From a paper:
Influenza A virus has two surface glycoproteins, hemagglutinin (HA) and neuraminidase (NA), that act as the major antigens. NA is a type II transmembrane protein that forms a homotetramer. The natural function of NA is to cleave the sialic acids from cellular receptors to facilitate virus release and from newly synthesized HA to prevent virion aggregation. Neuraminidase (NA) of human influenza H3N2 virus has evolved rapidly and been accumulating mutations for more than half-century.
To further examine the structural mechanism of epistasis between K385N and N387K, we determined the crystal structure of NAs from Bil69, SD93, and Mos99 to 1.54 Å, 1.65 Å, and 1.40 Å, respectively. K385N alone is unlikely to cause a change in backbone conformation, since Bil69 NA and Mos99 NA carry different amino acids at residue 385 and yet have the same backbone conformation in this region. Similarly, our result implies that the permissive mutations for N336H emerged between 1969 and 1971, since mutating residue 336 to His was neutral in Bil71 and Alb76 but reduced the virus titer of Bil69 to below the detection limit. Our virus rescue experiment further validated that N356D was a permissive mutation for N336H and was neutral when being introduced alone. Same as N336H, N336Y also reduced the titer of Bil69 to below the detection limit and the addition of N356D could restore it to the WT level. In contrast to N387K, N336H did not reduce the Tm of Bil69 NA. However, the first differential curve of the thermal shift assay for Bil69 N336H had an atypical shape. Similarly, the first differential curve for Bil69 N336Y showed two peaks. These results indicate the presence of multiple oligomeric states, hence protein aggregates. The shapes of their first differential curves returned to WT-like when N356D was introduced.
Residue numbers in the entry:
A (entry chain B), B (entry chain A), C (entry chain C), D (entry chain D): 82 to 469
Amino acid sequence: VEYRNWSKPQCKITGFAPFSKDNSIRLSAGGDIWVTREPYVSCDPGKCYQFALGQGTTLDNKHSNDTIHDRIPHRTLLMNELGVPFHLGTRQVCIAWSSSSCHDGKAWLHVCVTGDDKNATASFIYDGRLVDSIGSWSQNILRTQESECVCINGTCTVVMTDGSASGRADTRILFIEEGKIVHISPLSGSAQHVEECSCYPRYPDVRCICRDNWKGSNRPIVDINMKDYSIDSSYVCSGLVGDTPRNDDRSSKSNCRNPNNERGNHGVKGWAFDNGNDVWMGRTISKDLRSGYETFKVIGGWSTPNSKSQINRQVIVDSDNRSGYSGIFSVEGKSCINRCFYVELIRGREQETRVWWTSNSIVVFCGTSGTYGTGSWPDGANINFMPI
Amino acid sequence: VEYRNWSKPQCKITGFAPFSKDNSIRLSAGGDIWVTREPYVSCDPGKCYQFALGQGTTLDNKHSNDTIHDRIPHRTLLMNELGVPFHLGTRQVCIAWSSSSCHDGKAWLHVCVTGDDKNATASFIYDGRLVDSIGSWSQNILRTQESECVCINGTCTVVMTDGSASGRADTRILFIEEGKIVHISPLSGSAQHVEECSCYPRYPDVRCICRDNWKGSNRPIVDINMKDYSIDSSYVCSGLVGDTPRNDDRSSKSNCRNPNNERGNHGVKGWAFDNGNDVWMGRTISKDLRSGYETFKVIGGWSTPNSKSQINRQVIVDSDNRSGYSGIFSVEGKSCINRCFYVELIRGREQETRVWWTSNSIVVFCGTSGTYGTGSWPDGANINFMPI
Amino acid sequence: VEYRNWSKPQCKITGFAPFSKDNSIRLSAGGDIWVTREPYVSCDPGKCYQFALGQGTTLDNKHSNDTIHDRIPHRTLLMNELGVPFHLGTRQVCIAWSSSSCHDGKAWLHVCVTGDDKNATASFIYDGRLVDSIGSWSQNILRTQESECVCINGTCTVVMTDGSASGRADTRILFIEEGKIVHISPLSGSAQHVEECSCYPRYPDVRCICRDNWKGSNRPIVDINMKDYSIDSSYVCSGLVGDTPRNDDRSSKSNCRNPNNERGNHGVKGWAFDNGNDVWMGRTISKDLRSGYETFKVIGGWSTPNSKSQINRQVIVDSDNRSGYSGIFSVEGKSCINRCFYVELIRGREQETRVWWTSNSIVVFCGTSGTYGTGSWPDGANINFMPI
Amino acid sequence: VEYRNWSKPQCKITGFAPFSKDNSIRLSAGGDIWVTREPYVSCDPGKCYQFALGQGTTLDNKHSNDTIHDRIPHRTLLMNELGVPFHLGTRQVCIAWSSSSCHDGKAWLHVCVTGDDKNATASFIYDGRLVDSIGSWSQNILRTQESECVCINGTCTVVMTDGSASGRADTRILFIEEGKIVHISPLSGSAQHVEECSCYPRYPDVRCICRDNWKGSNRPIVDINMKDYSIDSSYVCSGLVGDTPRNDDRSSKSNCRNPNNERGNHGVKGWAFDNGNDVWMGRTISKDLRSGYETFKVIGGWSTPNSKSQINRQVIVDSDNRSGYSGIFSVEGKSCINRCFYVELIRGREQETRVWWTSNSIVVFCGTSGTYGTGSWPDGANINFMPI
Ligand SMILES: *[C@@H]1O[C@H](CO)[C@@H](O[C@@H]2O[C@H](CO)[C@@H](O[C@@H]3O[C@H](CO)[C@@H](O)[C@H](O[C@H]4O[C@H](CO)[C@@H](O)[C@H](O)[C@@H]4O[C@H]4O[C@H](CO)[C@@H](O)[C@H](O)[C@@H]4O[C@H]4O[C@H](CO)[C@@H](O)[C@H](O)[C@@H]4O)[C@@H]3O)[C@H](O)[C@H]2NC(C)=O)[C@H](O)[C@H]1NC(C)=O
Ligand SMILES: *[C@@H]1O[C@H](CO)[C@@H](O[C@@H]2O[C@H](CO)[C@@H](O[C@@H]3O[C@H](CO)[C@@H](O)[C@H](O[C@H]4O[C@H](CO)[C@@H](O)[C@H](O)[C@@H]4O[C@H]4O[C@H](CO)[C@@H](O)[C@H](O)[C@@H]4O[C@H]4O[C@H](CO)[C@@H](O)[C@H](O)[C@@H]4O)[C@@H]3O)[C@H](O)[C@H]2NC(C)=O)[C@H](O)[C@H]1NC(C)=O
Ligand SMILES: *[C@@H]1O[C@H](CO)[C@@H](O[C@@H]2O[C@H](CO)[C@@H](O[C@@H]3O[C@H](CO)[C@@H](O)[C@H](O[C@H]4O[C@H](CO)[C@@H](O)[C@H](O)[C@@H]4O[C@H]4O[C@H](CO)[C@@H](O)[C@H](O)[C@@H]4O[C@H]4O[C@H](CO)[C@@H](O)[C@H](O)[C@@H]4O)[C@@H]3O)[C@H](O)[C@H]2NC(C)=O)[C@H](O)[C@H]1NC(C)=O
Ligand SMILES: *[C@@H]1O[C@H](CO)[C@@H](O[C@@H]2O[C@H](CO)[C@@H](O[C@@H]3O[C@H](CO)[C@@H](O)[C@H](O[C@H]4O[C@H](CO)[C@@H](O)[C@H](O)[C@@H]4O[C@H]4O[C@H](CO)[C@@H](O)[C@H](O)[C@@H]4O[C@H]4O[C@H](CO)[C@@H](O)[C@H](O)[C@@H]4O)[C@@H]3O)[C@H](O)[C@H]2NC(C)=O)[C@H](O)[C@H]1NC(C)=O
Ligand SMILES: *[C@@H]1O[C@H](CO)[C@@H](O)[C@H](O)[C@H]1NC(C)=O
Ligand SMILES: *[C@@H]1O[C@H](CO)[C@@H](O)[C@H](O)[C@H]1NC(C)=O
Ligand SMILES: *[C@@H]1O[C@H](CO)[C@@H](O)[C@H](O)[C@H]1NC(C)=O
Ligand SMILES: *[C@@H]1O[C@H](CO)[C@@H](O)[C@H](O)[C@H]1NC(C)=O
Ligand SMILES: [Ca+2]
Ligand SMILES: [Ca+2]
Ligand SMILES: [Ca+2]
Ligand SMILES: [Ca+2]
């Protein structure tokens, strides 16, 4: 077994093709399925796995009541092969109300945060054993990516934040070797608030597109130098911005450098990736709510401030259906590294009627160099058919 | 590991012996089991797997209502070891309302079609990653075999159709290497309508027996030259024809060349294979409905037009019981390549109105050079005992 | 990997120690568990598996009604790791209302009989593929061991019967190499009726203790010469006889040669094995019904006609509780071959009329050279707590 | 594969970080989950497993009624990967109402005790086969650790007791090689009553911290010399004692040598381990009941009699929530051997009378050389939401 280097060029991308869907909520109405949120996907060299934060209960279960809450002690990281729904045989990998996972070519690293809001613990589990832990540095909800970390040549990197969700916070980039923290770098650059980074290998370095929860509806970028541990940060150049909420395309802005101060407060986890001067990105179709999901390329969207010429739009989830968090993962092919993404399809309380639970399913798409058509792949559950 | 070549002679066939049965619908009445249709079987070098298109729901589940519909975004390809029923731990391999799968000796290829009727996408997944995709070419339900594809020396072939189900359509034969489409050939020859091909290795080439949904109740043949990608097509010579609907045995015809224009409209997926001048074939026992299932050899049925001398009949499913789609798969033995088949046993709507769902179980038989008796192996569920 | 030879001495045996129990029926009252009967155990070189004939239904399921019947088309052979109860993820290995399985050191052989009573088919599946089949030779319920077959140096042997259960029948011993029948020997010797043999390796040969359903309450022995395929048969010498029904211990007889003509009609599958002049055997505690289970050694019980000197009695299931079929399996240790056995614990109809189903659990014990105490390990389900 | 030697220094310990939680009871209210008690954790060289004694039933099952009883024939040892809850696919490894398991680097050993109170049998199963057995030596509930045994250089050791729970008993230390008992040593030293030992490798020897059920609320130590099989015993020096019940912290004593005669009767399984002159230990927060769980270091707690200076306290389960048994396990890291522990979280009768069953979930923590915060990770089930 060799460490992954991800040392191939990025695949040609013309858009995205359907990859996986789990139908979690539909199945929940006729079977014992975990209540989850904050899912993601990560692949070992051979196969892909779906992850999510359980709520310590199945859906058709009185304990599913009031699972809207983000942090309870019973949350655990679930891990199944991609497309295997979270049934009762699912392994709970660690205790976590915030997580990141990645495979270095040899073994899995899991970063699992749990405990009190003001004094959380992050556990670092590698190759099936606890190797390290760190306590809260800002005493205000130590937290991490909710998507895959990235490892190059045996060094894995993960972005963590501690502090205010509505002001200056303390973001740190950890470097981890076989589960052991070997270095911690403070966030540097012009990103002013960084949450829930979606990171990808860009050999020899790592690049993250994140969520600004404070003043930006444009998405921050964090660049991680894997050689010298230096950090840089800015914002996606695209004038078509990626956060929710955001201004309408009529009036939205990004200058590549600063939070745009356009409905900056709050946000949603999302992703983008560069191809030369262009950017491929996803966002909710609604500028207001976590409804619908679309992808497109913005011509000059990586390099030209305020660029707004999009092309190659695809609807993933139509605007009449719920989405949620989304994130990137990378898959090594024969000659190139492909970029894929998942969309969390949130169902239940409070937005929807009848039910007392909050859960999600997932849909997953992967970059293609080929051709494709159109469709919409929403959660598909009928709220009227669900146990409450 | 080496690529499969299937470079052994076809096994001696005296008939077929029982191989597998999943009892899906019986189990559905007391357990959480997927609603499915369009099942098939395919084996890696070591063991066989059962596949089917899920309906994104279990049977004992309000979402099972109105699962008669062929295409919804929630359909996914399920894959279990043969004889493991589709329980909640089943892996959903891809998003698909039409599919084909095969193993090349090294890894699995899945061809998965989903999306809008007028603009579908086929994804090509190999060794657990998306390698290619193609969009609809005729804007009219791009679709494929619903049974195993065939790979020789690292090149896999699959037949796909796009266009009318009741007139001239656009059928293409794809050649795929490690998930990448390397060549596409148009259908050629005298077959006038080709659907749902059941294909098998006939080293060094591939041979398919398909469904003519337009003018033929005789089954089309598609011959695929794996060296130069050339295509030929015609019809099974046997005067005992394989489609449903069809004329009675007394008045049925085939001239090997043309659709017989005998109750040609509509059809059912099925199979046949050659042994010299003779043909082994299955069909529904009913000439009108998907009821019963029988196999037999037609003497001269491969090479003599309108041959009707049958022998070695076996009842697989008696005529009082429901069948459905059927297809071929091939299994490599020590010295020869064996031919096996599965039968889909459809239950529920529209025919059975006590329940609101549509699903199936499977029964599977394999070629034998030995001896055997008689029986009948239907679905076996009591419709009155079923959750509705 | 090498073929198993079983070429080690039989382990020292002082009695039996508890090995496994599945609690199938207790679990059935709170979970989806297969209805079964005719279970057995067989181990590959690494680990042991439990097998049984499913009834194509779970217990808490309307299809469980009237599962008293021995032969329906929906019966399939189930196979799990030993101690894993027959849940919905259990693999159905083949279609079978009578079966035998064994591992030759390289792969599994399964002998699976199904179809019409007067014209059954036995399928021979090896290394995951159908290799051979045979039809009924006496047109009267072709049938086999319901316990493990035995393979030495790549040749597996299995005993099959076709014909009357209450008169002269046609018993044959098959020799099978990688799934292919290479020789068939007729029964020879003085055993007059042979059913449901429990066989074990006695290098270089195989020895079976069976059920005489006709005139004997003493158990037949079948000796299989693996070199020249010759067959011999007689009866266990022990005056303490192993069948049910039987006479009481005071009046029972065996002359080693002939059926004893003591309540000879009917019987139950069981086992015994030799150690020099002595025999280790199990039997139901009741002489009338399949109630209770005991093991003991009979001193001179292998070599001395009508020997009744028992020692080392152990209660496996107390006489207040139901038993059923029992059979032998063999397990290779470091320096010796151990003998183990399972007991089928039958619940439901016809004896227990509150419920409409018939099913079983299992308990398993293995030979020990050590020491042990006493107990009773019955099924343990409360019939009043069961779904009916 | 090589035998484990555990020949690395003990890892630096600053405290404990969260590792695993199974949420068994919460899940039981919406899924088929085993009723258990007496859980533990043990890891092979790659992966950790959770074990527990089943009650031969699921929770939502009428058979769960009156599972307070410790010993029934239906109890079996369950084994899943750590964090996989005990679903219906769980393997029952052996018949056991008392158990210990460990991996020697090559294979699993299981020590499983079952049968009559006055005449129990312990089975020794290694590498999937029964290798040895021993009967009761004191005719009074032969019993063992309820946590992992320890193997060094292919020799595994386990502590067993037979005799009174409230007076002088007969404790023996067994030495087992590939499942075969090679030596038995009587308890020696000043420990006067030894139950339910929590043992760990301290190369080249093994050290156990146990439960005195008779005169001590201070915990006994058993030291096992793996070279000459000699045994020593005493009591943990710490004046902060580990048993429940016990005196309050102000009035509790230990002299390292004798049971303290302070509320000595009864107890609970627990653990401690040495670091130089200091001791790391866990205990219930309540001095009266199995409620809450805390860990801390006692400075001089290993070497100084009646030492009471604690530091590095952590709450694992707050005092408002139920705990139960706890035990140690050891995990080999790159350069050191880590110490971890599990806590049994008991729910139901007799304390909670709304329900009729008794079961548990688990939470698991591992030693860390890093930093951590605070929290509480109780069972989390709402008794009012449970099937009774
Ligand atoms: C079968 O499947 C294939 C493959 O999926 C389909 O082909 C794809 O079809 C897509 C839709 O036509 C196409 O993407 C489009 O590319 C064009 C550039 O050629 C781009 O303009 C499109 O983006 C606009 O339209 C979409 C809706 O389609 C809007 O959501 C989006 O916001 C864009 O609209 C904005 O810009 C327009 C142009 O300036 C304005 O006219 C419009 O009012 C709107 O303006 C707002 O935003 C501006 C900033 O962007 C701002 O200045 C202004 O003030 C407003 O605020 C879209 O990306 C794919 O390229 C194509 N794929 C391929 C490979 O060919 C095919 O159609 C399917 N066929 C069927 C029958 O199903
Ligand atoms: C135990 O098990 C074994 C193994 O399963 C059994 O042996 C098998 O038995 C099969 C049935 O006899 C046998 O297959 C038959 O082979 C003969 C040739 O030898 C063939 O004629 C049979 O086909 C006719 O009969 C079946 C029903 O059995 C019909 O479904 C079929 O359509 C055929 O009937 C048509 O042709 C006949 C002859 O011309 C006409 O009499 C009949 O009316 C009908 O005519 C219509 O169709 C014609 C076109 O074909 C058309 O010209 C006309 O106008 C009408 O429309 C069948 O294939 C197996 O070979 C044999 N297997 C082996 C290895 O021996 C055994 O019986 C079992 N034993 C018991 C006691 O259960
Ligand atoms: C703790 O556990 C250990 C290990 O499990 C226990 O030790 C075991 O204890 C067993 C019972 O004592 C013992 O087996 C016995 O061995 C003697 C020979 O030494 C043998 O005679 C015993 O067999 C008789 O008794 C059993 C009931 O125990 C009957 O079921 C059986 O049919 C036998 O009864 C017949 O023979 C008797 C003597 O000849 C007659 O009195 C009786 O009426 C009956 O006669 C009928 O059968 C005859 C043919 O057999 C026939 O001629 C006559 O006309 C009648 O029809 C039994 O096998 C184990 O050897 C021993 N194990 C070890 C390793 O020591 C220990 O007791 C446990 N302790 C506690 C307190 O739980
Ligand atoms: C964020 O998380 C971090 C990491 O978890 C937190 O840091 C940890 O904080 C712990 C609590 O302060 C600390 O452990 C403590 O260490 C001190 C020594 O420095 C030790 O004295 C503490 O033990 C006492 O207090 C705990 C409750 O905290 C009691 O349960 C315990 O019994 C001890 O109290 C007894 O002794 C005291 C002093 O002698 C008495 O005042 C008290 O009444 C009580 O006396 C009884 O027992 C005596 C025998 O011991 C007996 O003589 C007398 O008669 C009475 O019966 C505790 O171990 C950790 O070291 C620290 N961890 C690290 C790595 O720094 C941090 O606080 C969190 N952040 C925030 C803001 O909360
Ligand atoms: C959920 O819990 C709330 C109490 O917070 C209660 O009012 C409501 O009835 C519960 N829902 C159900 C379905 O029991
Ligand atoms: C299925 O849906 C139809 C149309 O809404 C309805 O009439 C029928 O009652 C439904 N079936 C069940 C069993 O709910
Ligand atoms: C089982 O079937 C019999 C015969 O049809 C019937 O009398 C009985 O009520 C059935 N049992 C149940 C529980 O439905
Ligand atoms: C449990 O058994 C007891 C004694 O038979 C009975 O009083 C009680 O009702 C049972 N509990 C349930 C929930 O059936
Ligand atoms: Ca924002
Ligand atoms: Ca047709
Ligand atoms: Ca008899
Ligand atoms: Ca005590």
